[PDB]
Structures are given as C-alpha cells and as structure tokens.
C-alpha cells in the first residue's frame, strides 16, 4: 500500500496524500470566515493563545501579501508561512515584470498551480493548508479566492474554513438567501466587520473577547489587520444593539 504514501493514484482514482493534507488543515482547530462589502473585503479568524508564555502579538494566521492583497490560512503555521513567503515573492515579481499590481484571483491561481504540482510530482508533498486570498481588486472589486492542497481554487461571495465550516457556511448561505445579493450592503468596512463577527457568533454559538479574534480588512489600494483595540471597538458596537 505505497499508493497512500506518495502522490499517485489508488485503484479508486484517489490521491490519499492530498486527502490527508486536507485533514492537516484542521489540525489548528481554528475557524476562518470571509465576506464582502461594497467597498471592502473582511476576513475574520479565531485566535487561540493556549499558552500564557506566548507573545500573543506574534500569533497570527493572517498575512499581508502585498499592499492590496491579504491572505488568511487554515492549517499548521510552518506551511502557512511557506505559502505566505512564496505568495509575497510572486506578488512582487509580478509587479516588476508586468508593471501593475498582481490581482487577488491571479495570485490564487498561481498558488493553486503550485499546489497542483505537489499532487502530480512525487518528491514534493502537498502543503497542509487552505489559503483564503482577499483584496479589493481594481478591475473586479471586492474579491475572495480560496486555494487548497488539491490545487483547486474558486472565487467566493463569502466563505468559511475550519472544523466547524459547515455551520458557518450554512449560516452565511441562509443570510444571502434572504438579502438576495452577493455581498453585505454596507458603506463602512467597520460595519462589515461587525457583521462578520456577529454571524460567526451565531454560527459557532460562542461569545468573543478582543483577544479571541483576528481581523483583516481589504479596501481600495490597501489591506490591513485590526489591532486588539480596533476589534474591541467592534465588539462594543455589536453588544450595544
């Protein structure tokens, strides 16, 4: 049974190493969520600092890839950082060669094509990570594009990733079935973040403090992460209505 050790086909037509890379994705036990506003894209993620010795400022699964692109990862941090560094390099090289900023979806495709190569070539293992790329693209507008270990990628109106993704997905599905639009009809990003946090609270059935969340926001011409105090201001606003 060496068809389960490397990236070759089993008799069923399955790549067991890809399937087991997907199971490594949830090893962190962290749930992420991404949604789109009018002018923005918000990504939130659970932040769990189990050790008191950890410096909580260094515990992050959100990465600033370029000025315009942000990337949240579901999976172990070494692979997350492997994928982050490569994406940064690709986003810089793109700008140099072609004279404009790498679009979100193009980066997602590029990283996916890399992930494909690990499923076909035996010496490379897949990365055990799901990469959720976010930007406000100058041509497409607010954009969510997600890559996985299989090399699959697709755009999203909103998305959720992790152990309890199905609960978050169905919560988001139901909201967009009501509103009948592809996005959160909201002017300020501040309120889109409040939505994201609120609908994760409802889906997971847990309350959050400022140090239980991690937030990334894409606007036109910059992506940035929120500090603990920025998140606190968000949580206060949620509680007050």
């Amino acid at each position: 049974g060496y068809d389960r050790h490397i990236t070759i086909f089993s008799p069923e037509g399955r790549l067991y190493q890809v399937e087991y890379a997907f199971k490594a994705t949830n090893q962190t036990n962290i749930n992420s969520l991404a949604v789109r506003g009018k002018d923005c894209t918000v990504v939130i993620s659970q932040k769990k600092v189990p050790d008191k010795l950890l410096d909580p400022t260094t515990v992050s699964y959100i990465f600033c890839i370029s000025r315009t692109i942000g990337m949240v990862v579901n999976g172990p941090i070494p692979d997350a950082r492997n994928a982050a560094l490569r994406a940064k390099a690709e986003a810089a090289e793109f700008r140099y060669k072609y004279g404009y900023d790498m679009p979100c979806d193009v980066l997602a495709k590029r990283m996916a094509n890399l992930s494909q190569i690990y499923t076909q070539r035996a010496y490379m293992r897949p990365l055990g990570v799901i990469l959720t790329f976010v930007s406000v693209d100058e041509e497409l507008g607010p954009s969510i594009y997600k890559t996985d270990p299989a090399g699959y990628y697709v755009g999203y109106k909103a998305t959720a990733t992790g152990p309890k993704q199905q609960e978050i997905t169905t919560n988001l599905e139901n909201h967009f079935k009501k509103s009948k639009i592809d996005h959160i009809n909201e002017e300020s990003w501040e309120k889109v973040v409040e939505f994201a946090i609120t609908h994760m609270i409802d889906a997971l059935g847990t309350e959050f403090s400022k140090n239980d969340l991690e937030v990334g926001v894409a606007t036109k011409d910059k992506f940035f992460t929120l500090s603990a105090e920025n998140i606190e201001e968000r949580l206060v606003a949620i509680a007050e209505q």
């Binding site: 008799p11 035996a122 755009g155």
Partner: protein
C-alpha cells in the same frame, strides 16, 4: 532537497495493464459528464458546472477554455490537472507553432501536442498521469471542423460525437440515436442540451451549464478593424442568457 524520483511511477503489471493509467481513467469516470457533438457548420462542447458550494461564484470556474481563437477544450475528471494542461496547451500553440509559421496550429496538431504532454506523464520519472480526459473541438482552414478526445494515456481519437465521465455510457447511446452527418450547429446544441439533462440531477439552466461552440468567424469579438484577412475567433462561449433561450425550445 533533491528530486530522487528519476524512475517511472507507471509500470506494466504482469497482466499487461498500466495500473496508473487505468486508475486515472477511473478518476475520469467519477468526474462530471461532459460531451462534444460535431455538426456540418460547427462543433459544440458542453458540461455541467457542478458547484462545490452555493457561496462559490461558478462563473469564475471556467471548465470550458479557449486554447486558440479557433480551438476550445472541455474536460471530465480532476479540474486542477485540466487547468495546468490548458496553460501548457496555450503556450505550446505559440512556441512550437505560431512563432515558427506565423499562424495558429490546426486542431489535430495542437491535440497531438497535448497528447504528447500527457503521454510524458505516463512514462517520465517521478510523476503520475494526468487524471483527466479532454474533449478538444476546433476548426482550421484545411481540415475544417473537428472534435478530438484525449485520454490519460496520451491516446487521442477523432469523434463525430461523444461523452466522457459520469454518465458517458448512457450519454453515448443517446448520441448514437440522435447524430447524423446533416446536423446544423443549432441542432447539435439542442441535442447537447438534451443529452446533458439526463446526467444532471439538480438545477438545469444557463448558470449550472457551461457550453461553447466552434462556429463562424466573429469579427465583432476581434477588437480591431483594418486587416481584411483576420476575421475573428471561431470559438465562442455561450452566455447564461443564450443557453436559457434554447432551453425554452427544448
């Protein structure tokens, strides 16, 4: 930090089977149904946009791809393998042909180049075969319209009409009854939509079906005027609206 897999991962078993190719064909079987039908004045290729989530934007996932202005491709099996094959197919059309002869390759030769790439994955060191079957529809000045199937093995066969993937056995029987050598392009599109309805469970509309044609030259889609010889791409992907129009007359 070495690639030590310089030996074939696909080998002959005692019975004479190449296991990895057969298993790649099994993966193609599990894949969503796609089909191709050749008419007198065109070719049509079609497939179901099997959406992994309703939150996903299935428009962004193009199962049907332009390879050259006059050649299009669709698949069944593993989507990521297909995507990279499309990238290589587009490039090989330029490097091994257009930059030499100053014109796009004919259908059969581009197919030959794709077939070669897939064959090499079946024999080269440290790689598994591609887990897709491709259907490539195209036109060129001296061969006219044509439809080809390309398997994980690197083998390719020209078809009048065929189907691959999930419900291909039932779909091919359906195409045998309906196909003739006097079909117009619209008739083939109609038959394509009928055949594809049988293998689809859920919704059946322009948003869940991807469908393209190789037909007449489209000078409106060219983008420029002033060269009489360049008359525009024969490949055209049908819109969500254009599919739903034909579904009323179904």
């Amino acid at each position: 930090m070495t690639d030590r897999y310089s030996f074939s991962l696909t080998t002959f078993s005692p019975s004479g089977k190449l296991g990895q190719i057969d298993y790649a064909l099994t993966a193609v079987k599990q894949g969503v149904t796609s089909l191709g039908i050749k008419a007198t004045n065109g070719v049509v290729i079609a497939t179901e946009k099997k959406s992994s989530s309703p939150l996903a934007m299935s428009e962004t996932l193009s199962k049907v791809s332009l390879l050259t202005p006059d050649i299009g491709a669709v698949y069944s099996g593993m989507g990521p393998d297909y995507r990279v094959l499309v990238d290589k197919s587009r490039k090989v059309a330029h490097t091994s042909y257009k930059r030499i002869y100053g014109e796009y390759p004919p259908t059969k030769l581009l197919v030959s180049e794709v077939a070669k790439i897939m064959q090499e994955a079946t024999q080269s060191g440290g790689v598994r075969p591609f887990g897709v079957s491709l259907l490539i529809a195209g036109h060129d000045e001296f061969n006219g319209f044509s439809l080809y199937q390309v398997d994980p093995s690197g083998s390719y066969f020209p078809w009048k009409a065929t189907a691959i993937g999930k419900g291909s056995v039932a779909a091919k029987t359906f195409l045998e009854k309906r196909w003739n050598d006097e079909l117009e392009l619209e008739d083939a599109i109609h038959i394509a939509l009928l055949t594809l309805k049988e293998s689809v469970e859920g919704e059946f509309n322009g948003d869940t079906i991807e469908l393209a044609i190789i037909g007449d030259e489209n000078p409106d889609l060219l983008g420029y005027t002033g060269i009489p010889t360049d008359k525009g791409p024969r490949f055209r992907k049908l819109t969500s609206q254009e599919i739903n129009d034909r579904l009323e007359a179904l």
